[PDB]
Amino acid sequence: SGFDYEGLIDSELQKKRLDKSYRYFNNINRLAKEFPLAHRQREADKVTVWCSNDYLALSKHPEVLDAMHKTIDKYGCGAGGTRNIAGHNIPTLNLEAELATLHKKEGALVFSSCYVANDAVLSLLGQKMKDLVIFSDELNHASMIVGIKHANVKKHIFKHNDLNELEQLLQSYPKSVPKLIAFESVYSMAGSVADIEKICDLADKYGALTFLDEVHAVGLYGPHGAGVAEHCDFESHRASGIATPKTNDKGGAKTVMDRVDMITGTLGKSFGSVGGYVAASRKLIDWFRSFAPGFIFTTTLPPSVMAGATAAIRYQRCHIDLRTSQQKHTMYVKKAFHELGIPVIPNPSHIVPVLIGNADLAKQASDILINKHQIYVQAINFPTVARGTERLRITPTPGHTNDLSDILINAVDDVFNELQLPRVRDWESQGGLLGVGESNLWTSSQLSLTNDDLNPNVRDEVSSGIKQ
Amino acid sequence: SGFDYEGLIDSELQKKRLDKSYRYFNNINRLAKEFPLAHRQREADKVTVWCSNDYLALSKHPEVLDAMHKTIDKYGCGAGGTRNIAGHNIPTLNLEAELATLHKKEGALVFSSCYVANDAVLSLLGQKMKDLVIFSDELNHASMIVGIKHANVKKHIFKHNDLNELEQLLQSYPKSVPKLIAFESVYSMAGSVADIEKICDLADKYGALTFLDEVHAVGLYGPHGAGVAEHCDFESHRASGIATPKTNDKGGAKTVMDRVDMITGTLGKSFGSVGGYVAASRKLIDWFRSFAPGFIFTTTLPPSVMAGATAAIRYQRCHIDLRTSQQKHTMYVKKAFHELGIPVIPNPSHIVPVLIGNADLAKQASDILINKHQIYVQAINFPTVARGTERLRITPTPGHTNDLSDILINAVDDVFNELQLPRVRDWESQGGLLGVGESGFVEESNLWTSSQLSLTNDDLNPNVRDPIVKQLEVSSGIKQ
Numbered sequence A: 001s002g003f004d005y006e007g008l009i010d011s012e013l014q015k016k017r018l019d020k021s022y023r024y025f026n027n028i029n030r031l032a033k034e035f036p037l038a039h040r041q042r043e044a045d046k047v048t049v050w051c052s053n054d055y056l057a058l059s060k061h062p063e064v065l066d067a068m069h070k071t072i073d074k075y076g077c078g079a080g081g082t083r084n085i086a087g088h089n090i091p092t093l094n095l096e097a098e099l100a101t102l103h104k105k106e107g108a109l110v111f112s113s114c115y116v117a118n119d120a121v122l123s124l125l126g127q128k129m130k131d132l133v134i135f136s137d138e139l140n141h142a143s144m145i146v147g148i149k150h151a152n153v154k155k156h157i158f159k160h161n162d163l164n165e166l167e168q169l170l171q172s173y174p175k176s177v178p179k180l181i182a183f184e185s186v187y188s189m190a191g192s193v194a195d196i197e198k199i200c201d202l203a204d205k206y207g208a209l210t211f212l213d214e215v216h217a218v219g220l221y222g223p224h225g226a227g228v229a230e231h232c233d234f235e236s237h238r239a240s241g242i243a244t245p246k247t248n249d250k251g252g253a254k255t256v257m258d259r260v261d262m263i264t265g266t267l268g269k270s271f272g273s274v275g276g277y278v279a280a281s282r283k284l285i286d287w288f289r290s291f292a293p294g295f296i297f298t299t300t301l302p303p304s305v306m307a308g309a310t311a312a313i314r315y316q317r318c319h320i321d322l323r324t325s326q327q328k329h330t331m332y333v334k335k336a337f338h339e340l341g342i343p344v345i346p347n348p349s350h351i352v353p354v355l356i357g358n359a360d361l362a363k364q365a366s367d368i369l370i371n372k373h374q375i376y377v378q379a380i381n382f383p384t385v386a387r388g389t390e391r392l393r394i395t396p397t398p399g400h401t402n403d404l405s406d407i408l409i410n411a412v413d414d415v416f417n418e419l420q421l422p423r424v425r426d427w428e429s430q431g432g433l434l435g436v437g438e439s440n441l442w443t444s445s446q447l448s449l450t451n452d453d454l455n456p457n458v459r460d461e462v463s464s465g466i467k468q
Numbered sequence B: 001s002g003f004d005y006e007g008l009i010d011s012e013l014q015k016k017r018l019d020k021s022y023r024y025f026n027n028i029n030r031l032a033k034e035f036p037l038a039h040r041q042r043e044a045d046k047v048t049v050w051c052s053n054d055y056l057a058l059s060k061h062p063e064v065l066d067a068m069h070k071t072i073d074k075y076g077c078g079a080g081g082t083r084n085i086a087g088h089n090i091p092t093l094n095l096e097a098e099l100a101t102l103h104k105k106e107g108a109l110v111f112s113s114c115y116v117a118n119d120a121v122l123s124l125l126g127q128k129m130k131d132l133v134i135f136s137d138e139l140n141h142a143s144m145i146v147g148i149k150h151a152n153v154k155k156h157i158f159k160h161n162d163l164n165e166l167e168q169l170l171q172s173y174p175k176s177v178p179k180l181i182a183f184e185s186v187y188s189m190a191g192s193v194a195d196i197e198k199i200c201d202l203a204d205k206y207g208a209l210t211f212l213d214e215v216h217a218v219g220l221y222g223p224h225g226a227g228v229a230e231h232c233d234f235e236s237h238r239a240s241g242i243a244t245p246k247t248n249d250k251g252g253a254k255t256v257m258d259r260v261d262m263i264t265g266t267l268g269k270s271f272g273s274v275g276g277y278v279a280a281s282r283k284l285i286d287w288f289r290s291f292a293p294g295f296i297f298t299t300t301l302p303p304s305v306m307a308g309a310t311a312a313i314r315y316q317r318c319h320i321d322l323r324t325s326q327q328k329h330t331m332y333v334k335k336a337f338h339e340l341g342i343p344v345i346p347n348p349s350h351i352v353p354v355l356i357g358n359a360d361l362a363k364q365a366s367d368i369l370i371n372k373h374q375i376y377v378q379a380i381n382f383p384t385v386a387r388g389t390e391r392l393r394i395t396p397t398p399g400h401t402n403d404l405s406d407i408l409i410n411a412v413d414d415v416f417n418e419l420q421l422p423r424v425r426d427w428e429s430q431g432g433l434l435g436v437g438e439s440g441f442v443e444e445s446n447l448w449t450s451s452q453l454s455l456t457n458d459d460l461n462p463n464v465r466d467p468i469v470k471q472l473e474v475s476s477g478i479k480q
């Protein structure tokens, strides 16, 4: 009689096993007193973590931990409500104010996660403008893909960073048609970067809104870690600090960061906590707040988790040493790999993707690294990346000092030898792949700045609704 | 002249202001050292919180706070990754095991929130069964509505708890058609309860899966706070404790909790933290884990927040005093309101919805209560509730002792007088509404009976206290 629900689930699972995309999770317990070590199942088995997105190691920062401990003593664990009922509070007000200050926007709105933030904003735009056309970069994150599907409007996918194709799509609509350009600043799987300035120019010309996911950039780019949008006018922002610059880096009236309509970020990476946000105009923020179901009808994040994020954001804002440090640690690993002929996918960012080119060998490498060498690096396979371009993702932080880097370099070299993995010159002979075998965002001048080169002012209503 | 984006936003906002559904938030800072007080903008301005969903006051429980503090010292703040990469850990394994133990299911899966959990599970069911027909209760939560929309399949909305209409809809399809019945155990806006047993019977007959949101029940119903599904076989579960009962409360083979395919809950109410989950079979859990994008592609919750929830769950499991206490505090307020003719929407649960019937007057009441009387109660308006049925939501907890209750009762009475709000007799004269002033309405008896309310922690099975809860292979993936 009845539909065979068990059989459908059995064979859907078995499909994932045969194509070998069935994932086994790793028991990884990060130690706050011993960054970036972690223990496995037993506390005795420790490993060095080289694939975390705790990019600035702020998850274990004293000011973050102190903020949590002190906030727990006063507020407890849960918020005990939503923003509409019993879950609106000062830690929330401070976190939203910080995020708005960071991107120098009129307002910011916090959600459970950036996944939720992206889904909420993209959903709402498409639901309230049925005529909207969304232009989405090929390599956008799952959350943006889902948000665009949920938007339920027309969409065009442009080839990765191909702004010719973007302009061709934009041009084919009248100017009066509402449009959204949705893209990331830094793409995490090989560390490519968007030309935000040129996209804003396109948006001005064809009358589009811009939606920029800076998830892999906040903390990391710009003098204050406000992202690649800030970095685009690095000197203007560094000179003005907290304040809006009088001009951009070309003497024009508005910065790239000012011109982007909507910037989303996470609290769960550089900022060492959990949560997501969008920063935008007062009007946009009030709009999302008043209509987004994924904002309204869910428990507010714990006060302590917000306090933690807020401290992480305040601290990194005026500690450019975090960024120069991380950039230097990255360059150090990249350069060492280059000398050993360990194939790194070239990129101008903080990520170190090591090309393997085979799913099995990458998984096998991952395993030997953790079991033989106590190095935790994750293998990236289909469908995150194209089949044949599988890789190890390595993400250095300020805490990966050169001693730790040396151990990694030696370990990776050993594994390449053990499994007879291709070196750079083996890729060269096959015509190259993704840059391997055939210009950093951080310049030398920028990398030699210290905290003394920041503006003193970076040291020390829409969130609630507006009356009418 | 491109599209006027600012003007569209301006007029969409202005629409919310004129219909008076534009919400202003209140700055409410809950004090863990003085439950259930909170301060406003200034620490000096304190108020009593009467509308929190921290139903058992476990947000400030010593075992919860200790678990957080100790977990932070070891793990830090963020998990620093997703479940696939660097964000799988022991606090996660323990939390999922506890949730599976609570609902006596083979597995459980933790998400950012129950909103996400609902959206993920409903989305996936409809995406992998395009032929699915979903039968959804009228009053389902926004998260379930969104999840059903995203499921992108056929749906029928049956009138609230009308299982005649449900059966009529179910009947009109062949048995072989895949079907889902999606409903809540306790509905939060007037505290109604579903006949879960009869819905499971319907599901057996017409070949449907059941999806049960127990968000407003976990912590509160059943001997161990496993929800209304547990309460349905209260004695069977109480006798067996942690273990699966040999029989249900009618001597039959399977409990109501066993028969429900998928149960979702929150960690953000009774369990005093944040997060969501689904409990179900090993196969269903592994399925969601392997395919749900809202599970896969997001940072894992902080270890400390999971540890907190886990402690909250372990503690309440063997502390039925939390439930009897709360039930008694609720009954006390309800009975006092009944004597003063303050119109409470009758219900067999822990919620105390005070009927006002006008959006402005409910907001006005809310304001006088907090400013004049230092009582924080929230007004519920359209679209959360039907226009003309606006109300104040009051949710007592074990911490709302009778002294606090007395002050509330007096305050609400004073405000009813100040604004000349309708009393029960005034509703009687308008024919009644939702049970208030409706002669020959026969109330559903409270879920908690006298016999159940007089149980103590000594009446629970010893095996629910400090149980060794083994971790689950399905939380990590299954070898074979």
Ligand SMILES: CC(C)(COP(=O)(O)OP(=O)(O)OC[C@H]1O[C@@H](n2cnc3c(N)ncnc32)[C@H](O)[C@@H]1OP(=O)(O)O)[C@@H](O)C(=O)NCCC(=O)NCCSC(=O)CCC(=O)O
Pocket (backbone or CB within 6 Å): A136, A137, A138, A139, A140, A141, A142, A144, A145, A148, A149, A155, A157, A184, A186, A187, A188, A189, A383, A384, A385, B297
């Ligand atoms: C297995 C596939 C091919 C996906 O599976 P399928 O082929 O079954 O899916 P599909 O045909 O794409 O159907 C799913 C829907 O995704 C949509 N879709 C795909 N790419 C899109 C984009 N950039 N913007 C908007 N929508 C997009 C398709 O149009 C389709 O919508 P319709 O149904 O309306 O046609 C995988 O390789 C994949 O991930 N493809 C998406 C493109 C990609 O490279 N994504 C980056 C993943 S990496 C990640 O998450 C990290 C990214 C980062 O941090 O930068």
Ligand SMILES: Cc1ncc(COP(=O)(O)O)c(C=O)c1O
Pocket (backbone or CB within 6 Å): A297, A298, A299, B113, B114, B115, B116, B141, B143, B184, B188, B213, B215, B216, B265, B266, B267, B268, B275, B276
């Ligand atoms: C019945 C019901 N389910 C789910 C939710 C959402 O759960 P969470 O707060 O865990 O996102 C709520 C919140 O209002 C609810 O009332």
Ligand SMILES: Cc1ncc(COP(=O)(O)O)c(C=O)c1O
Pocket (backbone or CB within 6 Å): A113, A114, A115, A116, A118, A141, A143, A184, A188, A213, A215, A216, A265, A266, A267, A268, A275, A276, B297, B298, B299
């Ligand atoms: C580019 C990008 N956007 C969005 C997200 C989602 O952020 P969250 O972890 O806060 O849900 C991620 C997560 O990895 C991401 O990499």
Ligand SMILES: [Mg+2]
Pocket (backbone or CB within 6 Å): B025, B026, B027, B040
């Ligand atoms: Mg206020």
